[PDB]
Point group: C2
Chain length 123, copies 2
């Protein structure tokens, strides 16, 4: 009865990334050391147990700024934020440990497991 | 270099639909005759030329209520809103003309073309 549009979810995500790139309807700034990253809380909640847990709570739902642990790796966060908006995870030898540790902190279980498989499949 | 997560966009969209179902971070009511439908403007902009054109404009970006033409078919709209959040288009003989006319009004070109192919593939 239904008609499956196989590229619709990917097209939506690309358009959501275009809106982020233009600061259209962005509602939060994530501060990570000296970095600031704007985003849509909806996308953060959709991709991260940590963000889901923060914004589902009525007490913190309307926060416009989130300060992460100053010890959180800014390149690791940037890689994971790009992943959330693209479905593409840039894992490399130079960044794997930073990305895996950041994904554990953001409670991105499927990404952590993928980093594990990565470590296992690499030297 | 990148690692493609083939189900990430679909998982994001499902989670965005869960947020809609719970009225979490919904920011607009679409009024269609005697019906009210809550949604995320980001998702409306991602799926519809009409909503994109309305909310990209700074003048209308912060509108919390949109009244559609009272002549817009509420079942047609409901079908298309469900499609936006699911990638699944419930086309049937009893609704095809209402959905196609509503998709033209919402400027959902790929959905209109799919309705055309539907008409062509049916008696
Ligand atoms: O699933 C996610 C985000 N998301 C992505 C990856 C991932 C993860 O690895 N762990 C968790 N743990 C929190 C799970 C939880 C707790 C309480 C109730 C329901 C779900 N969450 C993760 N978001 C979501 C869930 C349900 N409705 C709406 C949304 Cl936006
Ligand atoms: O593409 C869409 C929505 N969307 C879905 C289907 C569909 C359609 O069939 N026609 C149009 N016409 C408006 C096209 C336009 C006009 C001016 C500038 C760019 C694009 N839009 C459609 N949204 C979008 C585009 C670019 N950045 C961000 C977003 Cl959210």
């Amino acid at each position: 009865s239904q008609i499956q549009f196989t590229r619709h979810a990917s097209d939506v995500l690309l358009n959501l990334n275009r809106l982020r790139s233009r600061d259209i309807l962005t509602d939060v700034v994530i501060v990570v050391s000296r970095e600031q990253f704007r985003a849509h809380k909806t996308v953060l909640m959709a991709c991260s147990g940590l963000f889901y847990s923060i914004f589902t709570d009525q007490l913190k739902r309307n926060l416009s700024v989130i300060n992460l642990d100053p010890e959180i790796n800014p390149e690791g966060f940037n890689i994971l934020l790009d992943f959330m908006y693209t479905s593409r995870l840039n894992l490399r030898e130079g960044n794997i440990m930073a990305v895996m540790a950041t994904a554990m902190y953001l409670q991105m279980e499927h990404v952590v497991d993928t980093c594990r498989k990565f470590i296992k499949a690499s030297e």
